Design a protein around this ligand. Sequence first.
Ligand SMILES: O=C(O)[C@H]1O[C@@H](Sc2ccccc2)[C@H](O)[C@@H](O)[C@@H]1O
Ligand SMILES: O=C(O)[C@H]1O[C@@H](Sc2ccccc2)[C@H](O)[C@@H](O)[C@@H]1O
Ligand SMILES: O=C(O)[C@H]1O[C@@H](Sc2ccccc2)[C@H](O)[C@@H](O)[C@@H]1O
Ligand SMILES: [Cl-]
Ligand SMILES: [Cl-]
Ligand SMILES: [Cl-]
Lengths: 579, 579, 579
Amino acid sequence: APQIMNVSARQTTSLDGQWKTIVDPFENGYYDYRLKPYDGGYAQDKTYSDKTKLQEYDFETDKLLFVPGDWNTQRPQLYYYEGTVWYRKHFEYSLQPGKRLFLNFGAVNYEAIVWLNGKRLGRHIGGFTPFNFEITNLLKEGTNSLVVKVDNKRLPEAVPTVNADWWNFGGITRPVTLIEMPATYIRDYYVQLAKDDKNMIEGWVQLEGSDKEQKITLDIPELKVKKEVTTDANGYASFLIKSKPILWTPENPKLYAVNLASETDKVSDEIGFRTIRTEGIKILLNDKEIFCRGISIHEETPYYSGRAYSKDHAHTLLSWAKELGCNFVRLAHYPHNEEMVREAERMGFLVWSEIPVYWTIHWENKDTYQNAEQQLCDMIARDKNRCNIIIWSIANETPHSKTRLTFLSNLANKARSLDSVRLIGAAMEKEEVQPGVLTVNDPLGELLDIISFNEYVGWYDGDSEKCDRVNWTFDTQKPVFISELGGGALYGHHGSPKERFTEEYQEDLYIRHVNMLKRIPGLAGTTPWILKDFRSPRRHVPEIQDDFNRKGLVSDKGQKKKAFFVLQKWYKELTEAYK
Amino acid sequence: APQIMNVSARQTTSLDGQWKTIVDPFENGYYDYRLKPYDGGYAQDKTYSDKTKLQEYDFETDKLLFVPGDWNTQRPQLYYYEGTVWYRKHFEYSLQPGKRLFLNFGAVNYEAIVWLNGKRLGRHIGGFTPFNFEITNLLKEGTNSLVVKVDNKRLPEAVPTVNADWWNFGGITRPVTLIEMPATYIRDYYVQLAKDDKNMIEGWVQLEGSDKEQKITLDIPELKVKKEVTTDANGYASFLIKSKPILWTPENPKLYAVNLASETDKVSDEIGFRTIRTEGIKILLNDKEIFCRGISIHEETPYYSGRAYSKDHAHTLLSWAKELGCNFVRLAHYPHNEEMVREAERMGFLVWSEIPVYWTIHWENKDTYQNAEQQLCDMIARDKNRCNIIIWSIANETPHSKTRLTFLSNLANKARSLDSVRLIGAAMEKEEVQPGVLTVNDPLGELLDIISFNEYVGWYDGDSEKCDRVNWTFDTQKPVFISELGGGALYGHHGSPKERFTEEYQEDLYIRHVNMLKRIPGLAGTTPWILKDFRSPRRHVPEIQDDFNRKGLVSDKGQKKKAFFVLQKWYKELTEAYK
Amino acid sequence: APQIMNVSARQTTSLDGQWKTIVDPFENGYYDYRLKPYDGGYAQDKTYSDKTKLQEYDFETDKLLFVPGDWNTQRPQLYYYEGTVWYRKHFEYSLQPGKRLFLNFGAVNYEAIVWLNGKRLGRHIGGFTPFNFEITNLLKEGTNSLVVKVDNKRLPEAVPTVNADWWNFGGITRPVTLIEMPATYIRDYYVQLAKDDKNMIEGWVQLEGSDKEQKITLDIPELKVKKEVTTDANGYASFLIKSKPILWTPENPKLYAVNLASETDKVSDEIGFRTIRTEGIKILLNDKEIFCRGISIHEETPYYSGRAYSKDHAHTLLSWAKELGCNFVRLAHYPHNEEMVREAERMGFLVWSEIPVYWTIHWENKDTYQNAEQQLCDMIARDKNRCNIIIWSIANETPHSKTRLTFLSNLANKARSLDSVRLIGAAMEKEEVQPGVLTVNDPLGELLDIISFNEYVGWYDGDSEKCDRVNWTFDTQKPVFISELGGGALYGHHGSPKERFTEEYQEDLYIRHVNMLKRIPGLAGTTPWILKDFRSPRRHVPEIQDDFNRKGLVSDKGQKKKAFFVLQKWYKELTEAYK
Ligand SMILES: O=C(O)[C@H]1O[C@@H](Sc2ccccc2)[C@H](O)[C@@H](O)[C@@H]1O
Ligand SMILES: O=C(O)[C@H]1O[C@@H](Sc2ccccc2)[C@H](O)[C@@H](O)[C@@H]1O
Ligand SMILES: O=C(O)[C@H]1O[C@@H](Sc2ccccc2)[C@H](O)[C@@H](O)[C@@H]1O
Ligand SMILES: [Cl-]
Ligand SMILES: [Cl-]
Ligand SMILES: [Cl-]
């Protein structure tokens, strides 16, 4: 039930493919007509072969869905579906006694309830973070039954809440994986550079199980590093190691093979090393001033616009970012699958990672807060060894209020106590200093290392020309990072640059908007909205949006719009400028 | 806004056909990202003709839906849809000044918000009762814009609530009508026999408008009747008319042409006359003891299984009930469309009419009660001149509790305060006196004219054999009425009479269940469940249910299953024994 | 109307995006009720703006389809659809006086008929080869109307004919492009090594237009080559160039920038250089013995399984082939899009390219032969400069008749007269020498450089064990190339190695099939069937096939089956052996 670091390097067996499914809008499979739980609900996975008895379902003769994936793009009937779908899987597994077996979900949106062989394993909320169950003692010989009740109903108190600008993709959206472990295993570990110290590798390791005190060995063959330690009685041990590793950067994404070994377990990883700091309005990677030439990206696939989960999906999206000239990607509005981060790390993209605290969250709900902080904790726990990640962001656009402020401040501080290296960000509130002159105004900026905010001058705030008459001033000399900007266009739809939603309008906007960005003092990062057209239920212009937010520089069908090349040209100037 | 009696008889213009529509699952057209209402939402019906300005919708180029109709059967994507769909109609209408104009919706499930020319007319909850707006002063020349925002999300506090065994059919489910009235018009009237008096016609008439005191004439020509009264300062007048009409019966459903005429309006009707009362365990219609040879019916069409609304739909269903031997039909679980009631009155079926107070209603919620009572009032107000209805039911199966009893007693009193003639029913709690012997035990019965209850012996309570070892007894000596019973079968699926869901099992069930009914002391009525298979989201056996409740005696495709003829044979004998 | 070389390098304007469409199954848009052509059919693209007159259509208010792409996966209703769909596009283009403008279709399946502003430009048959029209003198000012009548009806006499094992993907399956040319332009050109000579570049260039005698330069800067020549009265010139270019291989796919300029035009290109020949049972690339570690690939996308067309599609597919350990890809069963071939060229994959001459072609129909030979000519003319293509194939599996022999012989002779460098292959008739001993017996073999054939021992011919019971011998000392082999499995479906369609069966099948391949004297190449599960209308096992051929080593969802790694291991050993 605790997070497992680097699942892909473990002893894994996939459960993916196609599973039997039951769409259950009124949750008949969970509650009876009194609205109470009942034995004999669908969790029992009872093949309906004796027809002298009465039951109301039969996984064995029902329809399939693919796992992993959203359900919305797999059947017309499921496009808008919000509610419960039951997934069932049968599998066999041979586990020698003493060995341990875990069931890992990369992600399930939004609530998952899980049973093995008719016995409840647990419950998860939050649709974008992994979770594990140990099934060591519940495995049976022969056929095992795995049942997952998945529900994506919008909940006022959820994270996110009843309103948002992206599709409500339900289902088992990321791979489902079995993991075999020795009785005491390497559960967690941290291997990064010490804060601001390019000559000190530091980290720790965490065993799990009963034989908690063991000789650990950390190997980095290419750095001639062989460090030994012994975990204390809590299965914990820390270390410092002197080394001068080649530093990861976007232009040389240097990664090192790291091998961890205990007396009873072992695991390998790819880990690069860098430092990241603020100095006034400057952002410093390995002590050099950099500009973050970024782009924002939803976890949505090329061509057919389902939930992304694979390396193929990551590679195609990033290869567009590459052509766009980015050295940075913002992954909105939630933690993406581990393959996106790994592929960004491999190709040399810095990363902004993020939780879906977004619009009208319930700031007074003690449960809502626990939810969001759990997501924050899990986002950082999974990716803490990914050096291309330099910004953690604890909030998107939010209405201002004292409850909001106290909520986000708790997240910001918690982020800082988990990762004293990377930069903490959040979407800050904007204020008019005097006409034609804008600034930021958020008392949460004291817990942030950057001045991050969204603005849509020229699309939602005025026509394009208004980018020509807006300017920005700041009362603090922290690096300024604009996390969203842009506007919509349908690829192939042409006309006057005054005609909104044409490629021509969007091109004119990006020209003028870039000129406005060139005037902003302290500007050190931008990630326009967005790389690719994506699904939203808030976009209803027929033949133009068709349930798609059209602010992509690339169409959902991979076609580069005219505005793609405006941003591309600017990023070329910027690359030479900071070279 | 007040109800209008006998809408079909007024000066009517149909707004039916195909309307433009927008599916809006997050309610973008009503709320903004702050979750606040905003001017400029879709109610403004603003055609998106000037693309220099930004807008997120356009009715003019969007998709159509049939009106009337559920949306669920019209598009695969809407099959499961729960949430907001916007409808938009354009129309012209010439109103001679002084004349008034009303907008009548037969039904909209579940919440309707209505606008004319960008102005809100009001809001309605309750998906099976009609409602009106006066649009006399809002009509413009040329094109008028009617926008209706329909939402069918299940609400915990709603009536019905978040669980129920029928499809959540959203949309504008019954015809939409323009009614023109004189400045002062006959709004409402009542013309029926006096309680247990086959020689006294009583009634009243109610005007609406300024000319409140008028001479009123009531003409029943075939009876050689003409009473001429005059209305008070409220527009109200009552009357008593000694007459010896031919009384309506199922075998001879006599109806009279009735003509009302004030100084400034007239309106005709077809009304019949009959007496109805209980005498001990007997039900007496026109002083003669009858048995209600009945069958239950959902408001759902033959063959394609959409929401029924037309005279054609009613006729097909009723001619199945005719062939079954019925003299009675129970319309579940809500007020059906008027066409259905009228068709039943004309062919000769007594009717049971009811409201969707069903399972876990929020008994302690005062708005919930107000909703249910409003639905009660609207039900009785519309049909009070329909002589063929003899039972109003205020409740279906509900849990046992004090709040439920208080709630249901208030409805039962209200029903009685609204109609002194018809019988009041409700699904009562049952109890097992001794093994094999059951009874009713429910203090609500004290407020009811019958012992009415649902029982599914042989389907939910045991296999078919258990019907042979269950018997009933009753303390109170009222007529006993079983409003639901039966079990499921797929037409064309055959096997052993032991195999559930074959035709042979359902036949065996009905044969044993009928012998059980024949041992029930005081049995006066049976409306078995059900006439035609119907859509339910709680029926998930593949290839057998497929989201259909299969307890019809007739398939959803009009095929008579074997059990149909069992019940038909008993109903033939009941016709003999009660002649 | 003639072919144009290197379309992507010219001055191009995409017409892609979404077009208006009319599904027209009875070709009402083209015939009247007399089955005769008629004026005012849909080719006239006449907006229905005057409802005083009668017409049966209106593109302006009809539905969209994405272009490029198959229609089948864009709507449920079009999945199986065979027939006509009208595509309509409006566009503007500013063509300076004297310049020429061409409409280029990458491909349309099967029959395309094309109109600009109501005038027929012409017709094309054959679904996988590009075609052009000149619209220089038809372009009008302002709004131009492009109408394409697309029909994919299966025709007995067509190429392919009424039966084949892949989906009938209809539509404008590949990009549509406007190409602007000077009044006299470089239409075609050839630049490659001379046969077997590592030290000699040969080639030619062809002009189109009235200024036919011009000075042409060919520059290859990295080779310090600058050749000037002058064209003759036919616009033709040939050349020879002593040079020692770095030779292209899969391991080092070196490409040279090549620049061509005449007096009025210029075009650049990327072209590699290699020699290829057979020597006995040996295939020699740049005089080195190679094994073709191949995989077959249909032109179908990962994940959603539409018609592939983009570099994104090719890269993902080819990336799987790279992980498999391939140095070679067979593109079946027709010419793929040019993106696929360029990406194989750039990444390092030798290529097999072929035409859809397949199963029961009408060998005696002269129009059928002309069609097949046109497809051959278009295939070779487009890719003659792609050094990575080393094999052209003029036929897949065919029946064993004299007319077939004549038909294919003429194809094989035409291919050789078009290209004397590349190898010519075709799937050859097999025969049983004696029990357990197969061979090839096909007189066509005289005209082919390799002994190429398909065999599915262990899937269609026996169980997996029969691979152990089969051996091969050949009378002729030519390299043996098996173009297809394998069997089906559903990813995630697990069982005994004896149960067909499990991953275990396919894995066992591949172990014993590879061992059979190890015993084949002369084996110089294999391209197993197939890389990725693909759609097929002859694959009907529910839950297993569901209209997919399951013989992929990769699921249609990117998942590597167990058998993938069997082939991967053998290719790893073949790599070391042929080092
Ligand atoms: O509408 C959009 O395109 C985007 O709006 C922003 S919110 C915002 C709007 C105006 C100014 C400042 C912030 C969301 O972050 C994004 O998910 C959504 O897609
Ligand atoms: O499940 C059914 O077939 C029906 O069950 C009854 S409730 C009940 C169940 C068992 C015993 C007593 C009452 C509902 O009135 C009905 O709408 C539904 O269709
Ligand atoms: O059935 C298959 O999987 C494949 O069959 C071959 S034909 C063949 C079958 C048996 C022996 C020799 C040749 C086709 O080339 C291919 O398109 C198709 O998919
Ligand atoms: Cl947009
Ligand atoms: Cl049922
Ligand atoms: Cl297959």
